[PDB]
Amino acid sequence: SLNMFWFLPTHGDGHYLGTEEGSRPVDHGYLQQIAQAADRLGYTGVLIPTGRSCEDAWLVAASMIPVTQRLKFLVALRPSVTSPTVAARQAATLDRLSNGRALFNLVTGSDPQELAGDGVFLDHSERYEASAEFTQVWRRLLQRETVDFNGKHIHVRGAKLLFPAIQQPYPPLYFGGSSDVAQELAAEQVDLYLTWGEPPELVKEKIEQVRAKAAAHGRKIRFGIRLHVIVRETNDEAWQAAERLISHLLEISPNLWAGVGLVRGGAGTALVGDGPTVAARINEYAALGIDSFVLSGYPHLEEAYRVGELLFPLLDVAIPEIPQPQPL
Amino acid sequence: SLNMFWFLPTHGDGHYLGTEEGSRPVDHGYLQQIAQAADRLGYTGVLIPTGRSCEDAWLVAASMIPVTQRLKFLVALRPSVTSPTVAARQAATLDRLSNGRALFNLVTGSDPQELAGDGVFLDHSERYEASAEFTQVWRRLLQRETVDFNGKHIHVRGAKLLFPAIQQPYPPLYFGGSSDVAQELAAEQVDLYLTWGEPPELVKEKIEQVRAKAAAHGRKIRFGIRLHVIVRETNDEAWQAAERLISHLLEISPNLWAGVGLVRGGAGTALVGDGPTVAARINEYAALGIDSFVLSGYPHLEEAYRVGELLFPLLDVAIPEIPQPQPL
Amino acid sequence: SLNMFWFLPTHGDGHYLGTEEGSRPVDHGYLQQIAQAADRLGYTGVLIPTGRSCEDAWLVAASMIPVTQRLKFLVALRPSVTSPTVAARQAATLDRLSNGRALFNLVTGSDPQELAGDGVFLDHSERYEASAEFTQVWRRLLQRETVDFNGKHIHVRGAKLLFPAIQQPYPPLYFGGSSDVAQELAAEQVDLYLTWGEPPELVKEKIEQVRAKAAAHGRKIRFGIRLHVIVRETNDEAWQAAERLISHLLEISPNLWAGVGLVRGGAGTALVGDGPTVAARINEYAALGIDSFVLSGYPHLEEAYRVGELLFPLLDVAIPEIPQPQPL
Amino acid sequence: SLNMFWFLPTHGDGHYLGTEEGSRPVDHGYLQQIAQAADRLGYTGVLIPTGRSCEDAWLVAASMIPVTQRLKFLVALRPSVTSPTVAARQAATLDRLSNGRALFNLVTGSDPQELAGDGVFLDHSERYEASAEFTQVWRRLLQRETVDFNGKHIHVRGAKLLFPAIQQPYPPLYFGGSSDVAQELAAEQVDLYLTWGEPPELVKEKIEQVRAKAAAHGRKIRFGIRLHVIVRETNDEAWQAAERLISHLLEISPNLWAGVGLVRGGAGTALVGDGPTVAARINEYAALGIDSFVLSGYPHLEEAYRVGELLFPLLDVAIPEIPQPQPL
């Protein structure tokens, strides 16, 4: 069964890419409209983004807690910019407050040098090694270990957590991107590798280069893929939807459009097609070892109902369950 | 009018101090019970504490957003472990998602080996040093400025917020500290000075200083007092309740009990008496020039009802109002 | 300023009229998605329908109470089938629980003889006279009057309300339809007359025949109109939307389609056009004395965001306010 | 396991009986405080009363839906003033909107001149007559049947539900009545018999009868007892609390106080004692064959916490669970 995730557009949303035409204001009330739509439709979770152009994701995720019952929140976590101890207490609180629905996604991100804006100036090599030190402590702190640590970048003493998360050993850990050295910090520490939506070929390959660097540390790793979606009644209708999405400003693979990448942000590619054809490329990707799909659409409210109504009926989607209350 | 605040006991709650007896489990559902209590009884806001013994305050606070309409959240802000930038982004996000209901509280940090846990190893001098840098950058950042600042502790380059907070010039900033270096930082940068409950005299003097040290900097500051409360219908039942509270393990001033201080839990003093009395002492404090009172009790849900039913009626309370949604 | 209402499709919803293709399941979670969309977008209220094919409207309306803050609920009330006393206690509770957001719409309805299914067999003449007796008691009970009454159809003794509604003299009363004798029960007792969306002509006339029968009792009466809406970027796009809405099975006035009436239920007509043109026919109707507009669309979630994003910016819409809490 | 229920004091609440002193205002926000209390403490359901002194139970109940996840609602059903059909539609809507959490309680009605208020003028014989007709039609209607029934009071033709309830064969039906005609109606049509708290003996006998009068009709019925509770840590504090409760205006059996009956408010008896004692008496009752206990207290929020913290631990409580959302 597949784990279908939607997305919280906390950087902004709308009907058209590249322009304020058809724009859609984003506030907690709209963000809650999407999270609840997702909770209601069967999505396992929702990816909540990171970056200084986005409302803070921990806050956004935690404010959706009393209003959803089974949706999980995939909060993007930038190692380098925060203490691993703090990050382990926040992660613990998120998991507890939501009763086991916290999920974390490690991010380091190359461009821009936004790190500077946040008092971080490590080299591409230093951030990737600090990231590795960060999540080692984090992984250890979330397992009840009192941690004394002082490597190149991270330095803590008697680091201990008074209250544990609920998921075990710790809330799952996801890692996106590709790079090269990136894949390593993952193969050695994360539970699932997130990859941009590329043609099956380039993707089958990255699954190997990843699965291998993981096996070398004798560990199993999962895969998810981040795609944009533009599904409709018919392909005719879907290509038109796609063109119009770009109309205020590419099929690099069967029903794979980089039209969405024609702008400085997002999922670069989108599965454009009718119901059975998008289902087809989706499964195809699942045949390659992808068990999770982080989809998206503009606008995200209406589009989550489309992928949920046109796609889900044609897929073996993993339907999440509301967890029972922890006994008092 | 007086601004009455309550407390979210994110560290734990119960009817007894120092033992697991009569304890009460704290979780999202019980914190919401109190938050929602506070919102309806008319408390202006609610203070949410900081420390390794506490669920993370930002998350806890953000989680009460969709479920309270007027209540404000006094959240702890830590100048050392977090970049002033992120902290500026979080403050803004919190303020926007709640539509203007965020307030911050500066916590410089103490001992023993706790800060060592978050990887911050600085001297009592250096921390108050880092705080001033920190809040100078945070305040500036929340005012749409771009920042390049390199002091003894804070190094930020090109730091700027893409999205603005709602309140101007920024979400109020509260601060405490009997320390000498502290009242200074407060008189210069903070909006409200927060002091523990103490006999009228000892507090007059603390208010005397600060109000002067502030004016010298060409500004008017505000004062609030953190008292634990134990009101009842008679003084006899009050003392009885006070005595009961400790029963499993002091009156430094007319109906001002230090009993609550026996254990390193919560505030140190507590008004203890019937209504008209506690009101009266509340009014003395008011007279000094204190417009805000951050009360608390055990257990914190039943007590919020106690202070809202026996005390509010005898006081001139500022009724918080629900902010109209921002225009779309 | 205009009072814009949306609609809660408690009989079912979807993308296409007359067929289960594109259908959309309706539950409390979806019904809450629409109510909240409406609360968030600026709609004064939402019309919640009556009939044995619909989830009970009082229940649906009351279950949206803790989740909305300013939306009003227009609950359809069929006089003949329930006691006026009960109906006055339920109306009182709805208004109190929502803090003044209850609105009631009187309905009698001709076809079908569904009344039978509910133990009601009065003649067309008997229901219209029982309706009149019903709301006379209702109007009186909601004004604190102890009521002794026994006419043809209604009979009560010592009828009194222990708790009053909040709106005064009573929650507003709306009346739909047309008929002839119908207009009378309205002109003599209701606050606003609801009329099906007909061309400006036939509508200007009904406003008179109504305004007159009201003036005869020396009272003022308001008007609202119930239309379906199909608004888009351009008229080209909107006519296509319209055709496709019917595609699984008429412009009786400029941009007025009875296509939607091509099925056994709904608003018979729909304003089909781009933004400025729908705005135009809307104002036109307002020029005639319509101060309230009950709009609708398929699906109702997505369509409420369309009318809210394409239409509202072009109209002088009355933006509702969240009412402050009744003081304790 | 025992099924513990609580009470929504829609008529009023406070710490004292018979006077406005120590009173507490009841509104949606406080009822939700208790409903939400009940949901988290593990009470199976909550009883919401009927009468002119009460906010309407259906509305009150429906309003707690989006905010509770497992708690059930015991709502009053009135056979005389409402058609059995509507009542069938409402029951179904309530059951569906809450996803299977509705339970009904039959109330036949008493004196004095109250029914006269709702336009129902029938004799003590005729009302129990109308009840049986009523619930026979309601039960049949909730089982997808079409109905034509003309008895001494209920006249229905072609009555049928377009949408089904969730629970089968229908939402449980509870009933009370010491009356002779009552235990009969109960043994034949109801799911659970509800009796006031009485000394073990007097209740054994009532249970003896009913269990027989039911089997004769070829069916197993269930029993529940409506007790007011006053548990504390010692019996002394209990009696003290019991005495305090009346202080502004009796032990018919070991720790079974009739004091709560001095005023026509709530139930007539009340268990009064420390934990292990009250548990014990709860267990006696259990033994008789009572699986459900509908408790209450003053004020009803603080008390639900009292009974859930001092009593539950000493009992074998049936932990309600959250129902998984119906498949889409």
mmCIF file of all heavy atoms in Angstrom, chain A residues 294-325:
data_model
loop_
_atom_site.group_PDB
_atom_site.id
_atom_site.type_symbol
_atom_site.label_atom_id
_atom_site.label_comp_id
_atom_site.label_asym_id
_atom_site.label_seq_id
_atom_site.Cartn_x
_atom_site.Cartn_y
_atom_site.Cartn_z
ATOM 1 N N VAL A 294 4.708 12.313 -2.201
ATOM 2 C CA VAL A 294 4.388 13.656 -1.746
ATOM 3 C C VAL A 294 3.907 14.477 -2.942
ATOM 4 O O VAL A 294 4.719 15.074 -3.694
ATOM 5 C CB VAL A 294 5.618 14.314 -1.139
ATOM 6 C CG1 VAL A 294 5.252 15.692 -0.593
ATOM 7 C CG2 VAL A 294 6.183 13.425 -0.048
ATOM 8 N N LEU A 295 2.590 14.522 -3.124
ATOM 9 C CA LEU A 295 2.021 15.241 -4.264
ATOM 10 C C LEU A 295 1.674 16.705 -3.969
ATOM 11 O O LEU A 295 1.733 17.151 -2.818
ATOM 12 C CB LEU A 295 0.808 14.453 -4.751
ATOM 13 C CG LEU A 295 1.121 12.942 -4.692
ATOM 14 C CD1 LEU A 295 -0.045 12.092 -5.225
ATOM 15 C CD2 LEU A 295 2.370 12.672 -5.514
ATOM 16 N N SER A 296 1.362 17.466 -5.016
ATOM 17 C CA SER A 296 0.992 18.867 -4.846
ATOM 18 C C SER A 296 0.198 19.398 -6.055
ATOM 19 O O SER A 296 0.168 18.784 -7.101
ATOM 20 C CB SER A 296 2.238 19.733 -4.590
ATOM 21 O OG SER A 296 2.992 19.963 -5.771
ATOM 22 N N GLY A 297 -0.452 20.550 -5.886
ATOM 23 C CA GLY A 297 -1.236 21.127 -6.971
ATOM 24 C C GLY A 297 -1.688 22.537 -6.681
ATOM 25 O O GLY A 297 -1.695 22.956 -5.517
ATOM 26 N N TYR A 298 -2.082 23.272 -7.729
ATOM 27 C CA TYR A 298 -2.493 24.665 -7.561
ATOM 28 C C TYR A 298 -3.902 24.790 -8.062
ATOM 29 O O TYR A 298 -4.164 24.429 -9.192
ATOM 30 C CB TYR A 298 -1.589 25.612 -8.391
ATOM 31 C CG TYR A 298 -0.171 25.718 -7.918
ATOM 32 C CD1 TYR A 298 0.788 24.870 -8.418
ATOM 33 C CD2 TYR A 298 0.221 26.674 -6.973
ATOM 34 C CE1 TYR A 298 2.095 24.950 -8.012
ATOM 35 C CE2 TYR A 298 1.563 26.767 -6.553
ATOM 36 C CZ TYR A 298 2.492 25.884 -7.094
ATOM 37 O OH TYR A 298 3.829 25.904 -6.771
ATOM 38 N N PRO A 299 -4.838 25.237 -7.205
ATOM 39 C CA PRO A 299 -4.534 25.592 -5.806
ATOM 40 C C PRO A 299 -4.501 24.280 -5.033
ATOM 41 O O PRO A 299 -5.041 23.268 -5.490
ATOM 42 C CB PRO A 299 -5.715 26.475 -5.402
ATOM 43 C CG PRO A 299 -6.223 27.002 -6.754
ATOM 44 C CD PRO A 299 -6.160 25.753 -7.588
ATOM 45 N N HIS A 300 -3.899 24.285 -3.860
ATOM 46 C CA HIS A 300 -3.778 23.047 -3.085
ATOM 47 C C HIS A 300 -5.034 22.516 -2.414
ATOM 48 O O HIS A 300 -5.070 21.369 -1.966
ATOM 49 C CB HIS A 300 -2.699 23.249 -2.032
ATOM 50 C CG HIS A 300 -1.328 23.454 -2.618
ATOM 51 N ND1 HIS A 300 -0.971 24.609 -3.285
ATOM 52 C CD2 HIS A 300 -0.239 22.648 -2.648
ATOM 53 C CE1 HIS A 300 0.280 24.505 -3.696
ATOM 54 N NE2 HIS A 300 0.748 23.326 -3.321
ATOM 55 N N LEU A 301 -6.061 23.344 -2.319
ATOM 56 C CA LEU A 301 -7.273 22.899 -1.670
ATOM 57 C C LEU A 301 -8.052 22.096 -2.677
ATOM 58 O O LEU A 301 -8.378 20.949 -2.459
ATOM 59 C CB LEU A 301 -8.097 24.108 -1.240
ATOM 60 C CG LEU A 301 -9.064 23.926 -0.058
ATOM 61 C CD1 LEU A 301 -10.372 24.584 -0.407
ATOM 62 C CD2 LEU A 301 -9.270 22.472 0.246
ATOM 63 N N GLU A 302 -8.306 22.717 -3.821
ATOM 64 C CA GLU A 302 -9.104 22.083 -4.842
ATOM 65 C C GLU A 302 -8.383 20.876 -5.424
ATOM 66 O O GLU A 302 -8.980 19.833 -5.671
ATOM 67 C CB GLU A 302 -9.414 23.104 -5.941
ATOM 68 C CG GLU A 302 -10.381 24.237 -5.530
ATOM 69 C CD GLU A 302 -9.658 25.495 -5.070
ATOM 70 O OE1 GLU A 302 -8.553 25.377 -4.485
ATOM 71 O OE2 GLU A 302 -10.189 26.602 -5.302
ATOM 72 N N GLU A 303 -7.082 21.024 -5.621
ATOM 73 C CA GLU A 303 -6.306 19.961 -6.209
ATOM 74 C C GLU A 303 -6.155 18.712 -5.362
ATOM 75 O O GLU A 303 -5.988 17.625 -5.923
ATOM 76 C CB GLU A 303 -4.962 20.528 -6.666
ATOM 77 C CG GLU A 303 -5.059 21.221 -8.015
ATOM 78 C CD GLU A 303 -5.826 20.385 -9.028
ATOM 79 O OE1 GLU A 303 -7.091 20.445 -9.045
ATOM 80 O OE2 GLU A 303 -5.167 19.649 -9.803
ATOM 81 N N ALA A 304 -6.250 18.847 -4.030
ATOM 82 C CA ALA A 304 -6.157 17.696 -3.133
ATOM 83 C C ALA A 304 -7.422 16.893 -3.218
ATOM 84 O O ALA A 304 -7.431 15.711 -2.900
ATOM 85 C CB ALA A 304 -5.930 18.137 -1.663
ATOM 86 N N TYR A 305 -8.514 17.540 -3.603
ATOM 87 C CA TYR A 305 -9.772 16.839 -3.761
ATOM 88 C C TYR A 305 -9.707 16.166 -5.147
ATOM 89 O O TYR A 305 -10.322 15.123 -5.364
ATOM 90 C CB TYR A 305 -10.955 17.816 -3.695
ATOM 91 C CG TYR A 305 -11.554 18.010 -2.310
ATOM 92 C CD1 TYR A 305 -10.929 18.823 -1.374
ATOM 93 C CD2 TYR A 305 -12.726 17.356 -1.925
ATOM 94 C CE1 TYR A 305 -11.451 18.967 -0.081
ATOM 95 C CE2 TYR A 305 -13.255 17.504 -0.647
ATOM 96 C CZ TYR A 305 -12.600 18.311 0.269
ATOM 97 O OH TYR A 305 -13.103 18.471 1.557
ATOM 98 N N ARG A 306 -8.968 16.742 -6.092
ATOM 99 C CA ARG A 306 -8.891 16.076 -7.395
ATOM 100 C C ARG A 306 -8.062 14.813 -7.320
ATOM 101 O O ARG A 306 -8.536 13.723 -7.677
ATOM 102 C CB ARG A 306 -8.339 16.989 -8.481
ATOM 103 C CG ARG A 306 -9.408 17.198 -9.547
ATOM 104 C CD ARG A 306 -8.859 17.708 -10.821
ATOM 105 N NE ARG A 306 -8.863 19.159 -10.902
ATOM 106 C CZ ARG A 306 -9.922 19.884 -11.245
ATOM 107 N NH1 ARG A 306 -11.062 19.284 -11.533
ATOM 108 N NH2 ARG A 306 -9.822 21.208 -11.320
ATOM 109 N N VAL A 307 -6.824 14.941 -6.854
ATOM 110 C CA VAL A 307 -6.009 13.747 -6.723
ATOM 111 C C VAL A 307 -6.751 12.745 -5.799
ATOM 112 O O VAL A 307 -6.638 11.539 -5.971
ATOM 113 C CB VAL A 307 -4.635 14.083 -6.101
ATOM 114 C CG1 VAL A 307 -3.848 12.814 -5.898
ATOM 115 C CG2 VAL A 307 -3.882 15.097 -7.014
ATOM 116 N N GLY A 308 -7.520 13.226 -4.825
ATOM 117 C CA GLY A 308 -8.189 12.279 -3.936
ATOM 118 C C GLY A 308 -9.399 11.592 -4.559
ATOM 119 O O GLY A 308 -9.763 10.467 -4.196
ATOM 120 N N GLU A 309 -10.045 12.274 -5.487
ATOM 121 C CA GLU A 309 -11.227 11.726 -6.123
ATOM 122 C C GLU A 309 -10.957 11.021 -7.435
ATOM 123 O O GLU A 309 -11.596 10.013 -7.750
ATOM 124 C CB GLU A 309 -12.272 12.846 -6.274
ATOM 125 C CG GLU A 309 -12.707 13.271 -4.898
ATOM 126 C CD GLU A 309 -13.724 14.372 -4.878
ATOM 127 O OE1 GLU A 309 -13.795 15.162 -5.835
ATOM 128 O OE2 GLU A 309 -14.450 14.448 -3.875
ATOM 129 N N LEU A 310 -10.002 11.536 -8.197
ATOM 130 C CA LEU A 310 -9.643 10.933 -9.474
ATOM 131 C C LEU A 310 -8.589 9.831 -9.327
ATOM 132 O O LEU A 310 -8.699 8.779 -9.951
ATOM 133 C CB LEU A 310 -9.137 12.016 -10.428
ATOM 134 C CG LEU A 310 -10.077 12.593 -11.498
ATOM 135 C CD1 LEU A 310 -11.537 12.128 -11.273
ATOM 136 C CD2 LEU A 310 -9.932 14.098 -11.530
ATOM 137 N N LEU A 311 -7.589 10.066 -8.476
ATOM 138 C CA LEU A 311 -6.503 9.108 -8.268
ATOM 139 C C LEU A 311 -6.708 8.001 -7.229
ATOM 140 O O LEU A 311 -6.625 6.820 -7.550
ATOM 141 C CB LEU A 311 -5.208 9.855 -7.908
ATOM 142 C CG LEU A 311 -4.133 10.169 -8.954
ATOM 143 C CD1 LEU A 311 -2.938 10.848 -8.289
ATOM 144 C CD2 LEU A 311 -3.670 8.898 -9.609
ATOM 145 N N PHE A 312 -6.948 8.361 -5.981
ATOM 146 C CA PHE A 312 -7.084 7.336 -4.954
ATOM 147 C C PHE A 312 -7.894 6.081 -5.324
ATOM 148 O O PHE A 312 -7.472 4.964 -5.005
ATOM 149 C CB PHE A 312 -7.629 7.961 -3.646
ATOM 150 C CG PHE A 312 -6.643 8.872 -2.944
ATOM 151 C CD1 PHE A 312 -5.518 9.356 -3.603
ATOM 152 C CD2 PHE A 312 -6.808 9.191 -1.601
ATOM 153 C CE1 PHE A 312 -4.581 10.124 -2.941
ATOM 154 C CE2 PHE A 312 -5.868 9.961 -0.934
ATOM 155 C CZ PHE A 312 -4.754 10.424 -1.598
ATOM 156 N N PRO A 313 -9.072 6.242 -5.981
ATOM 157 C CA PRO A 313 -9.913 5.100 -6.374
ATOM 158 C C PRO A 313 -9.215 4.114 -7.305
ATOM 159 O O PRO A 313 -9.654 2.954 -7.437
ATOM 160 C CB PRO A 313 -11.115 5.757 -7.078
ATOM 161 C CG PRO A 313 -11.222 7.095 -6.442
ATOM 162 C CD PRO A 313 -9.729 7.510 -6.351
ATOM 163 N N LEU A 314 -8.154 4.592 -7.960
ATOM 164 C CA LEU A 314 -7.374 3.801 -8.912
ATOM 165 C C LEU A 314 -6.058 3.289 -8.334
ATOM 166 O O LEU A 314 -5.274 2.668 -9.042
ATOM 167 C CB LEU A 314 -7.044 4.640 -10.153
ATOM 168 C CG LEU A 314 -8.153 5.245 -11.011
ATOM 169 C CD1 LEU A 314 -7.505 6.158 -12.022
ATOM 170 C CD2 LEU A 314 -8.966 4.170 -11.700
ATOM 171 N N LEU A 315 -5.808 3.555 -7.055
ATOM 172 C CA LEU A 315 -4.568 3.123 -6.417
ATOM 173 C C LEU A 315 -4.831 2.366 -5.127
ATOM 174 O O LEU A 315 -5.921 2.431 -4.572
ATOM 175 C CB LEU A 315 -3.684 4.338 -6.119
ATOM 176 C CG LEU A 315 -3.196 5.167 -7.305
ATOM 177 C CD1 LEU A 315 -2.464 6.421 -6.800
ATOM 178 C CD2 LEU A 315 -2.251 4.323 -8.156
ATOM 179 N N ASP A 316 -3.813 1.650 -4.654
ATOM 180 C CA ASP A 316 -3.908 0.871 -3.419
ATOM 181 C C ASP A 316 -3.275 1.793 -2.403
ATOM 182 O O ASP A 316 -2.124 1.610 -1.994
ATOM 183 C CB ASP A 316 -3.099 -0.427 -3.551
ATOM 184 C CG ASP A 316 -3.120 -1.282 -2.292
ATOM 185 O OD1 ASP A 316 -3.883 -0.981 -1.347
ATOM 186 O OD2 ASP A 316 -2.357 -2.275 -2.258
ATOM 187 N N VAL A 317 -4.035 2.801 -1.996
ATOM 188 C CA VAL A 317 -3.501 3.777 -1.066
ATOM 189 C C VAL A 317 -3.630 3.316 0.369
ATOM 190 O O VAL A 317 -4.635 2.723 0.740
ATOM 191 C CB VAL A 317 -4.192 5.168 -1.248
ATOM 192 C CG1 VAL A 317 -5.011 5.174 -2.540
ATOM 193 C CG2 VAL A 317 -5.075 5.494 -0.050
ATOM 194 N N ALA A 318 -2.577 3.568 1.153
ATOM 195 C CA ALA A 318 -2.559 3.239 2.573
ATOM 196 C C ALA A 318 -3.448 4.234 3.315
ATOM 197 O O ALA A 318 -3.102 5.414 3.426
ATOM 198 C CB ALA A 318 -1.144 3.351 3.114
ATOM 199 N N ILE A 319 -4.578 3.778 3.829
ATOM 200 C CA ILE A 319 -5.455 4.683 4.566
ATOM 201 C C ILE A 319 -5.090 4.717 6.052
ATOM 202 O O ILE A 319 -5.239 3.725 6.772
ATOM 203 C CB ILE A 319 -6.946 4.320 4.364
ATOM 204 C CG1 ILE A 319 -7.129 2.803 4.185
ATOM 205 C CG2 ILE A 319 -7.477 5.081 3.146
ATOM 206 C CD1 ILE A 319 -6.833 1.965 5.411
ATOM 207 N N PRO A 320 -4.583 5.869 6.523
ATOM 208 C CA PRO A 320 -4.186 6.029 7.920
ATOM 209 C C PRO A 320 -5.313 5.884 8.911
ATOM 210 O O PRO A 320 -6.491 5.987 8.579
ATOM 211 C CB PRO A 320 -3.551 7.415 7.946
ATOM 212 C CG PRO A 320 -4.365 8.150 6.970
ATOM 213 C CD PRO A 320 -4.404 7.139 5.800
ATOM 214 N N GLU A 321 -4.928 5.638 10.153
ATOM 215 C CA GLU A 321 -5.894 5.426 11.203
ATOM 216 C C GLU A 321 -5.708 6.428 12.284
ATOM 217 O O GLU A 321 -4.584 6.914 12.531
ATOM 218 C CB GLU A 321 -5.724 4.035 11.807
ATOM 219 C CG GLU A 321 -6.080 2.898 10.873
ATOM 220 C CD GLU A 321 -5.891 1.546 11.525
ATOM 221 O OE1 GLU A 321 -5.027 1.425 12.425
ATOM 222 O OE2 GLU A 321 -6.603 0.606 11.126
ATOM 223 N N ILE A 322 -6.816 6.755 12.928
ATOM 224 C CA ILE A 322 -6.750 7.682 14.032
ATOM 225 C C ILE A 322 -6.207 6.831 15.167
ATOM 226 O O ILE A 322 -6.722 5.757 15.437
ATOM 227 C CB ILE A 322 -8.147 8.199 14.454
ATOM 228 C CG1 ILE A 322 -8.874 8.826 13.259
ATOM 229 C CG2 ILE A 322 -7.956 9.162 15.595
ATOM 230 C CD1 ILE A 322 -10.335 9.328 13.513
ATOM 231 N N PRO A 323 -5.162 7.294 15.848
ATOM 232 C CA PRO A 323 -4.618 6.504 16.947
ATOM 233 C C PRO A 323 -5.454 6.720 18.208
ATOM 234 O O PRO A 323 -5.988 7.822 18.422
ATOM 235 C CB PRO A 323 -3.213 7.067 17.083
ATOM 236 C CG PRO A 323 -3.419 8.525 16.813
ATOM 237 C CD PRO A 323 -4.392 8.539 15.647
ATOM 238 N N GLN A 324 -5.589 5.679 19.031
ATOM 239 C CA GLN A 324 -6.367 5.799 20.248
ATOM 240 C C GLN A 324 -5.603 6.684 21.209
ATOM 241 O O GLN A 324 -4.407 6.930 21.038
ATOM 242 C CB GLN A 324 -6.621 4.442 20.925
ATOM 243 C CG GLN A 324 -7.489 3.439 20.138
ATOM 244 C CD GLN A 324 -8.684 4.050 19.398
ATOM 245 O OE1 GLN A 324 -9.636 4.572 19.996
ATOM 246 N NE2 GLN A 324 -8.634 3.974 18.080
ATOM 247 N N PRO A 325 -6.305 7.225 22.203
ATOM 248 C CA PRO A 325 -5.660 8.088 23.183
ATOM 249 C C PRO A 325 -4.725 7.334 24.110
ATOM 250 O O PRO A 325 -5.018 6.224 24.546
ATOM 251 C CB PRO A 325 -6.833 8.694 23.923
ATOM 252 C CG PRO A 325 -7.860 8.911 22.780
ATOM 253 C CD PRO A 325 -7.757 7.479 22.142
#
